[PDB]
Scaffold this active site. Structure first.
Site, PDB file in Angstrom:
ATOM      1  N   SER A 145       3.209   8.455  -0.739  1.00  0.00           N
ATOM      2  CA  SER A 145       2.086   8.203   0.161  1.00  0.00           C
ATOM      3  C   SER A 145       0.933   9.139  -0.150  1.00  0.00           C
ATOM      4  O   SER A 145       0.455   9.174  -1.295  1.00  0.00           O
ATOM      5  CB  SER A 145       2.517   8.343   1.615  1.00  0.00           C
ATOM      6  OG  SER A 145       3.594   7.482   1.879  1.00  0.00           O
ATOM      7  N   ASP A 251       1.583  -3.018   0.236  1.00  0.00           N
ATOM      8  CA  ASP A 251       1.894  -1.749   0.867  1.00  0.00           C
ATOM      9  C   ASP A 251       1.426  -1.745   2.318  1.00  0.00           C
ATOM     10  O   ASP A 251       0.307  -2.156   2.623  1.00  0.00           O
ATOM     11  CB  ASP A 251       1.199  -0.638   0.095  1.00  0.00           C
ATOM     12  CG  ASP A 251       1.508   0.702   0.651  1.00  0.00           C
ATOM     13  OD1 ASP A 251       0.746   1.144   1.530  1.00  0.00           O
ATOM     14  OD2 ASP A 251       2.528   1.289   0.248  1.00  0.00           O
ATOM     15  N   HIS A 300       6.642   0.591   2.496  1.00  0.00           N
ATOM     16  CA  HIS A 300       5.844   1.799   2.299  1.00  0.00           C
ATOM     17  C   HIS A 300       6.767   2.956   1.949  1.00  0.00           C
ATOM     18  O   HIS A 300       7.687   3.255   2.716  1.00  0.00           O
ATOM     19  CB  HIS A 300       5.063   2.117   3.569  1.00  0.00           C
ATOM     20  CG  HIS A 300       4.155   3.289   3.426  1.00  0.00           C
ATOM     21  ND1 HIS A 300       3.194   3.367   2.440  1.00  0.00           N
ATOM     22  CD2 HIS A 300       4.081   4.448   4.122  1.00  0.00           C
ATOM     23  CE1 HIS A 300       2.554   4.520   2.549  1.00  0.00           C
ATOM     24  NE2 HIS A 300       3.070   5.190   3.563  1.00  0.00           N
TER      25      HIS A 300
END
Ligand code: RL6
Ligand code: NAG
Length: 358
Positions: A145, A251, A300
């Site tokens: 991330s 995503d 994610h």
């Protein structure tokens, strides 16, 4: 279990001035080092950082950090969970700078918060050299991330740091998971009040953090436009260190900033085309990224999930692809050991191995 070490240089701090740190599990007899950058969004002004300090304080402070953490996924030391690098020296670097790992600014008379992400990475590397990293053959800087974007922003600086410190034999590489975003048009438009458009959020944060970007990318985009270097498809071609890119084609963080909130309700034509175009755009940006893993899933993060071994693209798992990448960097493609794995099917979960969300 990885054990906490607060930085000996206590000038290198989390947002609130508490010392930054790292969690370490050594594996001597291994010359592989995995340094993983945690993610967790960012904050870009006094008001939104204050809010983050109230309810996400572990991402702004080390005062409440536990003494140990359990390594999971690529940070696991069990071959069953981590077929790729289970015997490596493992380092988890908590994200406590809220700056996508880009900041170089101390808390001070003018600054309520310190944004030291770029300096935290450099200081962790420096202190690890005395704990065995000096004997490394490979340092893989990984991250998920905001930590994945942090890899892209910092991998070449780690390489330059080690070269200048006199360790040119350590091969620095990057593994960027879920940090490859598009500065695309939102499905619906909002003003950046908190869901901020990609570009507007970063433009403000860089000034607030004194954010730094890789030199070649900075020289291309020049003063005032360094926000461009937070977007993988723009910064990646400027990088010299080998970087493996992991990115879900749909995503969830990308969809969130695009103001797509998948409700379970039926999907109309406009949103269907929007989602399919997002997948195609992401796929297109990866066409010339030789080491990549991009499944057609709505999800994610991947690499520190315990079930990270489950997803496959064209029958190849991520741990296998990373192993093939390792082989490809030994001193021409490899039979049955691919490194470029991008789904071509156009809708979330068209790949049957996608995470179930259970
Ligand atoms: C989830 C997260 O921490 N992110 C970090 C960056 Cl940078 C970023 C960007 Cl640029 C977009 C467009 C969406 C999410 C992002
Ligand atoms: C601590 O870190 C800062 C920022 O990188 C650096 O300027 C300073 O020299 C460091 N101190 C020591 C003793 O290494």
């Amino acid at each position: 279990d990885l054990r906490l070490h607060l930085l000996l240089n206590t000038s290198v701090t989390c947002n609130d001035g508490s010392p930054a740190g790292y969690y370490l599990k050594e594996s001597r007899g291994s010359r592989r080092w995995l340094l993983f950058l945690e993610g967790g969004w960012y904050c870009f002004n006094r008001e939104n950082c204050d809010s983050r300090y109230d309810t996400m304080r572990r991402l702004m402070s080390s005062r409440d950090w536990p003494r140990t953490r359990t390594g999971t996924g690529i940070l696991s030391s069990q071959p069953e969970e981590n077929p790729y690098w289970w015997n490596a020296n493992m380092v988890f670097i908590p994200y406590c700078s809220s700056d996508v790992w880009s900041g170089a600014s101390s808390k001070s008379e003018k600054n309520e918060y310190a944004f030291m992400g770029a300096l935290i990475i450099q200081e962790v590397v420096r202190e690890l050299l005395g704990r065995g990293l000096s004997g490394a053959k490979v340092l893989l800087l990984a991250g998920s991330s905001a930590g994945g974007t942090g890899v892209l922003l910092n991998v070449d600086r780690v390489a330059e740091q080690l070269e200048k410190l006199g360790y040119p034999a350590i091969q620095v590489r990057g593994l960027a998971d879920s940090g490859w975003f598009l500065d695309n048009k939102q499905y619906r438009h909002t003003d950046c009040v908190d869901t901020c458009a990609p570009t507007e959020a970063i433009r403000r944060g860089i000034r607030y953090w004194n954010g730094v970007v890789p030199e070649r990318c900075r020289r291309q985009f020049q003063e005032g436009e360094e926000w461009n270097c937070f977007f993988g498809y723009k910064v990646y071609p400027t990088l010299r260190s080998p970087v493996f890119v992991v990115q879900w084609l749909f995503d969830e963080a990308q969809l969130t900033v695009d103001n797509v909130h998948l409700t379970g309700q039926p999907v109309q034509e406009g949103l269907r085309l929007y989602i399919q175009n997002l997948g195609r755009e992401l796929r297109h940006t990866l066409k010339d990224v030789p080491a990549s893993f991009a499944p057609a899933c709505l999800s994610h993060e991947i690499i520190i999930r315990s079930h990270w071994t489950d997803v496959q693209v064209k029958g190849t798992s991520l741990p296998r692809a990373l192993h093939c990448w390792d082989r490809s960097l030994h001193d021409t493609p490899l039979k049955g050991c691919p490194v470029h794995l991008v789904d071509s099917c156009p809708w979330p979960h068209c790949n049957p191995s996608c995470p179930t969300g259970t």
